[PDB]
DNA sequence: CCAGCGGCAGC
DNA sequence: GCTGCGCGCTGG
């Protein structure tokens, strides 16, 4: 499954290949604008390129990178814990993992797996993409 | 100046 | 269903 590129340019469209990177991206977009979050995401992924590296990280260093975005301490710790469960838990859907709710899970089911038709998103940009996929079907 | 808006866990 | 986290942002 390859999610097609849309006129909306969701960051999920480029990160679908690595579910961990796609899910980290949804964490960055939790109550934070893409214009603000996305530049910082590329810096985080430079310092922490995988779940293996991120799970062994000190949350205070992650928090320092998130500081300009807000929700910097809560998400720094969430990132470390999610990355640990991502690797240790037997999960089929990422909603099973700490820090991933409906929005990250709907993102995973539309971009990482071919399950877009069974998904009912309730997040603006995600809805624009999903509605577009139902249209250009 | 100042108030409201944009995920998720844990209660 | 309620709260808290936390900044930038927009509106007047």
Curated annotation (Swiss-Prot):
It is found in: Nucleus. Mismatch-specific DNA N-glycosylase involved in DNA repair. Has thymine glycosylase activity and is specific for G:T mismatches within methylated and unmethylated CpG sites. Can also remove uracil or 5-fluorouracil in G:U mismatches. Has no lyase activity. Was first identified as methyl-CpG-binding protein. It is linked to Tumor predisposition syndrome 2: An autosomal recessive condition characterized by predisposition to develop a variety of tumors or malignancies, including acute myeloid leukemia, myelodysplastic syndrome, colorectal adenomatous polyposis and carcinoma, and uveal melanoma. Melanoma, uveal, 1: Most common intraocular malignancy, arising from melanocytes in the iris, ciliary body, or choroid. Metastases develop in more than 30% of case patients, almost invariably in the liver, with poor prognosis. The active site is at 123. This is Methyl-CpG-binding domain protein 4. Interacts with MLH1.
């Amino acid at each position: 499954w390859t999610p097609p590129r849309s006129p909306f340019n969701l960051v999920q469209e480029t990160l679908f290949h690595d579910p961990w990177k796609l899910l980290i991206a949804t964490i960055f977009l939790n109550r934070t604008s893409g214009k603000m979050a996305i530049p910082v995401l590329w810096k985080f992924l430079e310092k922490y390129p995988s779940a293996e590296v991120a799970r062994t990280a000190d949350w205070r260093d992650v928090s320092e990178l998130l500081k300009p975005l807000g929700l910097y301490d809560l998400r720094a710790k969430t990132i470390v814990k999610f990355s640990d469960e991502y690797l240790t838990k037997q999960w089929k859907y990422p909603i099973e993992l700490h820090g991933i709710g409906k929005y990250g899970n709907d993102s995973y089911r539309i971009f990482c797996v071919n399950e877009w038709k069974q998904v009912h998103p309730e997040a603006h940009k995600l809805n624009k993409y999903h509605d577009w996929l139902w249209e250009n079907h």
